[PDB]
Amino acid sequence: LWQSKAVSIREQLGLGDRPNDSYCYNSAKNSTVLQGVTFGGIPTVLLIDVSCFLFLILVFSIIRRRFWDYGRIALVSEWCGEDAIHYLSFQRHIIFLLVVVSFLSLCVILPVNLSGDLLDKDPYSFGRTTIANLQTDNDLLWLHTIFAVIYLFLTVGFMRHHTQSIKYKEENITGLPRDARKETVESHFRDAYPTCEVVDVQLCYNVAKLIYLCKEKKKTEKSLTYYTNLQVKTGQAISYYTRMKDRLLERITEEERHVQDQPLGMAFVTFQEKSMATYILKDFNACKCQPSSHSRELYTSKWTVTFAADPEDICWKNLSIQGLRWWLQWLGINFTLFLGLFFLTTPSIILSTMDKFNVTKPIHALNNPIISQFFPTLLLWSFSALLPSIVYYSTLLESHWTKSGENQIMMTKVYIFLIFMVLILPSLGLTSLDFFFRWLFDKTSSEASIRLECVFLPDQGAFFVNYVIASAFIGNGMELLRLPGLILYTFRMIMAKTAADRRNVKQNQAFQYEFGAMYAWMLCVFTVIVAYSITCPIIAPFGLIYILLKHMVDRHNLYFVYLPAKLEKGIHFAAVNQALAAPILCLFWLYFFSFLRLGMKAPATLFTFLVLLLTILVCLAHTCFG
Template structure:
């Protein structure tokens, strides 16, 4: 379904660009060519808005069309958003996440607390969170060794197959290298990994994360508890946003320190990752990585400045071929595109290093950062004249040289490069080919190479593709009025991008499971394109005609009104999560999550049979690591109350029993 949303988003942008292209070429371009400022100077300058005289009444047409483009963008994207919200992936459920500040040894105490505080809420399933990162890694390696061993046995023709056990053993030509039997090597490796997995399974209960996923019977129950936990502190007492209610409590609330729990919606089970990263460590990594990328971004624009400076100031006079138009016009855009193509890779791996708690937030952060960095590097700095040191000095001392006609040519060349070169490179997938080549070189045997060939596909990175496409779309819309000749090449880019992405989604990449918020945020970022067009048009009008010119005031009023509406919408969206009164949003799952529960007695918990998401990792499910008390259970109000000491002792005995049987309670990475 994510691929459907993504391709639908591209089709809506194509439809929008078709209308913008027709309007810009049929109306804006002829109007720009009626001017005479660049009649005998720059042929390309005659097609830009800079060709019109100051105070020309035709400038009103540009302001009106900018407003029309904004309205049209809102209408088209609104239609796309309505289709996203109308599609439901499966039964709607709600998930709540609790963060405990301590480890309680009594699961029954937690259930008793919620039974008293919320007597009408029925718990269907509980999945505890443990640090199983190492366990999942070992199990993946075990499965990998088992598959390679299977390939060796299938290929076995009765002759002993020898292999070099070292890394890149297939490339080693030394006769002195020791070779071993392939089947024996992978059999031993699989047994060793299986033993490590068993040891890790026994050690998992000693590493709780303080997180639990609790599924309720209905969505209304989950919303009710979430509303109660989202109460705000007001005047020393816990109350809702309207200060008309308190958080419900029970006899165990003070003992369990319920007031320190945090409750949020949880994503799809396949959307969860990196839960073992603590809060403090995550924030430190996040700040450090993003500061490094921000500093690196500064140096990514310097090659273009150097190339243009060499041509502008004739620094390299002995090298005559540097003065050709190809070097001064096409090569800077190609160089900038090359660095902007490198930026998604940098942002991708930096976002992975941040360790987000679910893949949707990871893709969302990737899309936001990539869009901001690309916009800053591709659109903002070149528009201010910072692609050339000579123009930089002109920009410092002459404010009317900010929007030069040759900058429009720069962006036209950039869009052409992105359409023709960029689409072809995405179809070739050279980074994936490089990774595949490295993996093949590191293979130790023919069976391992065959395994690499069968497992070379990766998930489609929606965050990277959204950020890249939206950056080019913003460039197109920002200059659709100032330089209307950019629009047909922008339409060509979107068409080629749509065809390439559709091919890759069907034949190349694996499917991904993301939250709808990723697609909705892409819509919000697309709305920034016509707003930037208004900003560019306003700056041009102020610099050419003055602040008090009618066109400047009209553009300023529309711009301020648009920004106010956008900010209000954004902040109201955020305030909605603080308010416990309204949760009318599209949710994927309705489960409640609680932390640090420990099963005391399996016979006391019999849950009703109902359908709920499985939050166990696939690796643990394959290992037959199940709940010690079963998957269906429900708390009984007649269960006896245990003292903390007795509960702790009972849990210790239960855990020892589970270890002896190699059973682990609800594990989660």
């Protein structure tokens, strides 16, 4: 039924014989590898992954209070926030959004798709459940679009409930406008900034950052050369201890002199300028930027004057040189990151199709689902767990000026890059590979009938259902275990030597919850779910289990482990924006597929284009106008 008779039926079904049937793989030599691995893979992947959940959560119960304490590491030594009841509330509102999605979806769409004809002669073939709803003629293909709109309206709504709970605390009057003007001179800005009827306080023209580097280095070096002069019961190997005073020398000589040599050069460098025009005229000036004091308009501050940044934040270090140099750096960084995305996604996609190439081979040779549907999705989960961090490092090396801005950009970029990898790259690559497969299966010499009717995805959508299942199970497992972390803790304390240091380590492993990266992970998976939902119904049921198992793993993690944190209220709103993005990406994938298939000028695709266009437009309004 699932491993025995299973293959038998598929092996010998259709065999041409199309009095009227469309099947898809009708032109088959008995069978074709392009058919599909059993039920899609969902059976074997679920078992292998639910086993893994039940392994990882059985290697947590054992390690919680053992392994030093990487379980409760926060309930140990010196409730969880208000910026956590918000994250948990987002999670809850998404649980309910997806419960509704699941219900509606499953019911309506599973029936709609199952009433198909293509990919239907096969009994068990994830495909019958996906979009194998004929092409035209099936009027039901309109339903998909009308249900997609139900999903955007639903997510606008359920997210609004969430945003009617995250109380923007009447925050941002920061009378400190910035600038980006010409080098040289200062009091001329202490003339034009005055304009007329304006009460400035100060100016301060930004300079450089070599000093900043040395300082932090010297302070950390100081930490070393001071504290590590103890060792053999002295005071803040043995040969290293006898060279630690020379390393202390290094700090107090090289770096020290170096420090002072930077003030030597401070005045030399010149960049832009902040200004402390206080009161409320800030607005006036920021709005103007204009003419007023033309006497003092050599450089006309022909550069942006952009409110403030609040001294605490402004990464003085990264005031590169603005303009050209900064954006080129940005370009470089983002492009390397994109080529990396390509690399990872490629490996996983090709593992997944490394059987369905020669499309003339019998369905026998389709590779066990655990080398086409588990291993691929696990590698993608894995390489999509490095992305959170590589994106962080990238953000740093882009010289983002404002530090809060850097935090939010980190959130948005983890989102973009993750969404990308998973959803997008696989979708594009797989759909392209299927166009390819359907060329090579519908070669038939000059019959260029690459029936773009059955070109959905190589596995008919299973790659992503399996990514979601994988995620849910294995990932909630690994967020509960946080294996990489237990490993560090362990070793850090295996070489703790003294129990003083032990205490130190335990009193240190207690990261404040990063409600930035986590919002993003959750939302990348929510995006996969919603996007493929109306076009691969089964993903939602196996996705409510993701968010239900993440509300659960986070109500553990955000209490037992992970320290209380407080974030800019902006990070919660970026999440709401990203879920709205998920439903719009769903409408967009419905479009892409109704364009590959179903032509490009038929009612179906046109309806979905209309909605897509309108939605992108109203969204643009709320971005610009508001």
